[PDB]
Amino acid sequence: PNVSRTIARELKSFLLEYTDETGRSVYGARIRTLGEMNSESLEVNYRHLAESKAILALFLAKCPEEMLKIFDLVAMEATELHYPDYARIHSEIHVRISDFPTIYSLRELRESNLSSLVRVTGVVTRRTGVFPQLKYVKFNCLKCGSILGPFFQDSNEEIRISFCTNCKSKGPFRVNGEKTVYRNYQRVTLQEAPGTVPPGRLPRHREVILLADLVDVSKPGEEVEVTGIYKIIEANSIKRREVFSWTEEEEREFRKISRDRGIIDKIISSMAPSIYGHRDIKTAVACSLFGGVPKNVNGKHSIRGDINVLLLGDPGTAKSQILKYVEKTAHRAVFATLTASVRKDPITKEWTLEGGAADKGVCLIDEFDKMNDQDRTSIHEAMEQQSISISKAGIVTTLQARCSIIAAANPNGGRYNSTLPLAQNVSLTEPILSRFDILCVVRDLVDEEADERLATFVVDSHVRSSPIPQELLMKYIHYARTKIYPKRHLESILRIAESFAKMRLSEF
C-alpha cells in the first residue's frame, strides 16, 4: 500500500524531533553509538512514540510484521544520511521495541493474540544456537533429471511431497544443497516461572525463535522478559533483568506484625503445621530460606549470602515433607533429585550442551549420599564459589550460582551409631562438609513423651477425614528479602545473626 509512504515520512520527521529532556535529541546519540560500535540494534521505547502518535502504536499492536517493514528502512536511511557508506558493511538494521505496557502470561496466550506484539515472562531452557535451518525446500529426484519447485518450509512440521514435475515415481527425494537457503536458528524452549503459577495447575511452555544477533546473550535458568510477535513466538527484544507480590495495603501491617511480641518463634511454629517436630530442623530451615546479605570490598572478596543446611538421621523420620512444604512456600524453590554437560538428544541424534540451573532461589536435594561424580563436583563448585562454568559444544560461559542448598541424607546402615563421629558415619569427607555450615541431626526417642505426641498427631491427621498464617508468612519472605540489607563458623554465625535481624526487620 501507499499508506506506508505517509507513515514513513511521519516517523522520519519524528526521530529528528524527539527532545524529552532539556531539549536534547537523544536519537542522535543513539545513532552515533550504533554507528561507531557497528551495532544493528536500535532502541525505541513504546511510550515515546505512543505519546507522539497513538495510531503508530495501534498499527504496531495490530500488524507488526508490516509495521516492521517501515522501521528498518527509515533506520537505514537515517544511518545512511548520518554516516556515509554504511550499507557496504551492514545491509539491514533492526529495531528493539521495548517498554510494552500489557505484560501477558503464558497461560493467556490465545487465538486472539495471533499476529501481534506480546511481552511475556519466563525461564529459558534447551539452548541450541547458530544453526541455519531450512526456509525454502527443494528436492533432488533420482528417477529424472529435474528438480522440484520451491516450497516454503512450514516451521513447525516437515512437508512430504510425492509428486514430481516429470512423472509419478516411487523414488525418494533428497534435499538439494545447491538451492536450499537456510535462515538462522535460536531454538529456545521458554517455560512459566514457578513463583507465580496458581496452585493445582501446571506451568506451560512455548518455543521461541531468536534471530539477527541476540544469540548467547541469554542465561539459562534465569527469569527473562521477551517482547515479540505471536504466530510459536518470534522474539524481537530480550531482557535478562527480569503475580504474588506485596502491596501498599499489606506492607504497613507487616511492620506492625514484626514490631510486636517476638515473631521469630512464631515463624518457627508456623514452619511445620503437619507435625510437632523440634525447633532444630526448622530454625536452620527458616534461617536458610530467609538468608543473609552478600558483601564485597572494592569489587572483590565476594562472600556467600546463602546458608546451606544438611539434615541427617534415621530414614523413618520426616525429612522430605519439610522440603516439600518449602517447595510450595518459598519463591523460586527447585526440588531436584544443576550440571552443565554435552548430552544426546533423541530427535535426529542432536548434540547440545545443557547448562546448570534458581539463581536467587533455594535448591532442595534429597538422598545426598546416593549420587555420582558429576553432580557432586558441580554442587561442590557451587558451594565453594558462586559460579558454574560451561566449556563445551562451542560455548564458554560462566553463569551465576548464588543458590541456597537444603540437602537431606541418610547414614550408612540406618542407625546413626552415636559412639562414632559424623565423618566416620557419613560417607562424605570434610571439605564437602565444611561448605554446609549447619548440620542438623535427629535421633531415636524411646520414651513416653515422643510416643504421647507423634502418634497422637499422626492419628489426629487420619481421624479428621496462635501461629502466623501461611499467606502472610510467604508474603513476608518476599517483602523482607527484596527491600532490606541490615549491616567459617564466625562467618556462619554473623550470617545467622543478620538473617535473624532480617526476620526481625531491624536496621541493624
Place this chain on the structure above:
Amino acid sequence: VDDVTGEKVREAFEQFLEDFSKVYRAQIEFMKIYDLNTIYIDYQHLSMRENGALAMAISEQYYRFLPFLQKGLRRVVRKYAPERVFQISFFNLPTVHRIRDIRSEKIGSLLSISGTVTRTSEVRPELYASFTCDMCRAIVDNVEQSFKYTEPTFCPNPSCENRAFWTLNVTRSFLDWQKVRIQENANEIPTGSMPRTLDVILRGDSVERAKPGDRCKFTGVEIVVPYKISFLACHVISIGDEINELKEMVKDEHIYDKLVRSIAPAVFGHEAVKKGILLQMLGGVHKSTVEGIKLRGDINICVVGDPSTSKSQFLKYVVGFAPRSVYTSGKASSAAGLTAAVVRDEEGGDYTIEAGALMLADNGICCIDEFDKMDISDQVAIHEAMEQQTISIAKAGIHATLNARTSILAAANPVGGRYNRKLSLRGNLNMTAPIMSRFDLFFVILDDCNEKIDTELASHIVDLHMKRDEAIEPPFSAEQLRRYIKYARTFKPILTKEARSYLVEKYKELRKDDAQGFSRSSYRITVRQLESMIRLSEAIARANCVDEITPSFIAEAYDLLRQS
C-alpha cells in the same frame, strides 16, 4: 439432493437452539467472556425434537450436514452476540459400540467408541493458509484442509500461463492436532481373538484431556484414511436380588472368616497371606489432610520365602479374578517397559509414547513376580512412583505428569533361595533401604517336614488333579464377592477417639518389644509401621462394613503385624 436439505436442517438446528431458553443460550453467554467456542450438546437432549426423526436424519448424514450446523451456530451467535474458530461436540449416546462391530455401513455417521488408550503422540499444528503464486502477487484465502490442500482452482487475475500450480505460505493462516491409539477392552475380547487396535485423530480443545493408560469413551465420526478406516473424536471422558444378597451378607457375624478362606480357595494354609491379599484390594482415605497434599492411602504387599511354594498361585488368582489387575514377570521389563515406553522414529512420523504396565488399572493391584532380578532403574522408578503419587515423563522436549494410585504385589526370593533364620530381612532380601520402605506388610513363608499338614497338602494336591472338584470349593462364590468388594469400596469409614487412645498404647506396646530385643524382632519400628496399621484399620472397617471403628477390630491388625 442435500443442497436444499442442508438449509432446512440448518433452520431446524437453529430453531432447536433458538426456541430453548435446554441450557444452551446461557452456555453461550457464559463462554462470551472466555471465547473458546468448544460447546457441548447432548444427543439425548436433541433426541426429543421431531419425535427423534431430526436426530436420525442428522445421525447418518453428519459429515454432509456439519457445515450447515456450524453455520447455524455461527448465525445464532452472530445475532445473539457481537479470530473465529468453532467446535461442536456431541455426547451421551444411548448405545456403546465396540471396535469389533465397526462396518462400512457407518462411514461418515457418528459413533461411540469405548476402549483403552495404548499410545499417545505429540501435539502438532494443523494447517486448516494463504497461497502465493510465483508469477504475480495474487493471494487467496478460501482453503481446503482434508485432502487436495495444494491446488486451488481460481486466481483473481485470470491472465496467466499456468492456472493450476501455486506455492504455500506459513505466514498468513493453525491449531492443536493429536493422534492417539485406542484398543479393545480386556473384558470384551473374543475367545482366541486378538485385541485389535486402531488410531483415532482429535482436534479442537478435546486434546490433552485424555490421559494415557485409562479407559476412554469417544464420540465422533468414522472417517477413512488412505485405505484404512480411522476415527475422529470430539468428546473425551475418563470413564471407569443383588441388594437382597448384599443385605443378607452384611447382617451376619462370620463373613470375615469365610472371606479369609475364600479369597484363595486353591491354596492350603497361609491365612496371613490371604488376610493381606484380601485387605490389599481395598484401601483407605488418601486426602486426609488440612495442608492440601494427597497421602499414600494404599496397601503394599510383598511375599518372600523358599521356592516351589504356592505363593505364585495367589499371583495367578488376582489377575484371573480382579478386573483392575496387571501382571508382569519382572525380568521382561525395564524402566520404560513398566511405566511408559517410547518408539524411536518409526514409520516416518515422530516419537510416540506407549503406556506400559504402570499407571494402568488405577486403584487396583499391580503384581510384579520376581522383584529382585529387576534392575536399578525400574526399582528407583518404582520408588519415585511411591514417593509421590504422580509420575513425570520428560522426553523429546515435552514434560507430562499424571496421577497414579496402584497397590504393589511384589513376589521376591532370597539370594540363595533358602530362607535362613539367623539374620535380618535386609541382608537376605538384598535390596536397599528406600525401596525396602513404603511397604505395609511382609509375608515370610518357611517350609519343613511336618507330616500331619504335609499329607493333607499332598492329598489336596492329588485331589485337585481331577475334572472340576469340590475340594477347592469356597463357602460362597465370587458372584456376590465382586459386588461386596464394590459396596465396601464406596463406604468411606471414619475412625474414633477410643480407637486412637488404644492405638497410642498399642504403638507403645509394639515399640516396647524393640527394647532388649534381637529375639522375636527383625526390623526397625518408626512412623511407617504406624501408618501401615492405620491404613489396615480402615480396611478392616470397610471389610466389616462399620462406619465407626472399635479398637477390637484393630487388635486383629495388631496381631497380624505381630505375626509378621
Place this chain on the structure above:
Amino acid sequence: ELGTSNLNLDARNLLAYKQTEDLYHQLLNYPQEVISIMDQTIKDCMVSLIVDLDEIETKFYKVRPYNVGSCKGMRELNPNDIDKLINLKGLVLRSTPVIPDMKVAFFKCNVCDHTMAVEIDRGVIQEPARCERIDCNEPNSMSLIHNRCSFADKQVIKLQEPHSISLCVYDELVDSCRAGDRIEVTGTFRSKTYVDVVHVK
C-alpha cells in the same frame, strides 16, 4: 422372519437328486453366472410362496454352496481350474485391517452445481470428459471426491493350508474368520492367484 438373507445350500443333495444332475455339473465350472441367476430365482420362488412385500421387493438374497468334495490344496489347482469352486482345509494365521472398495463413484464439478453419480463396471471407472451438454460446456473442469463415495468391506487373510495362500473376504463375512481356528473354506479360484470365498465353516 428373523431377517437372515443368507441361504446355506448343500450341493450333495443336488448331486443325489434325479432331476438336477445337470445343474451340479454346470455350477462347478461357472459359479459367477449361476449365483447371479440363483439370486433372481430364489426371489421369484419366495414371492410365489408369498402369493411383507414392501421390503422383499428390493431385498437381495444369495446362496453359499459348501458341500463339495475335497482337493489337494493349491498343488492340484492347475490352470484349467480357474473360476471354479474349490475348498481348502487348514488354519488361518493373519487378518489384515479392512480395506474399502468403491461401489458407486461421485463426481463433483467446480462450476454449474451439477454432481454426477456413476457405477463401477467390474474394475473400471468411466471418467467423463464431457460435462452434461444440456448444461454449459467445459473441457476438463471435473473433480473426484472420496468422502461422498460409497464403499464396501474387503479383507485379505493369510491361510496355512505347507503353503500360505492369500484369500480375500468381502462384506457381511468380515471379522467372522480370524487366526487360531481350524477352518474349512470354499469359494472361487481366481488368477498371482487367489480364492474368492463363497462360504466359511
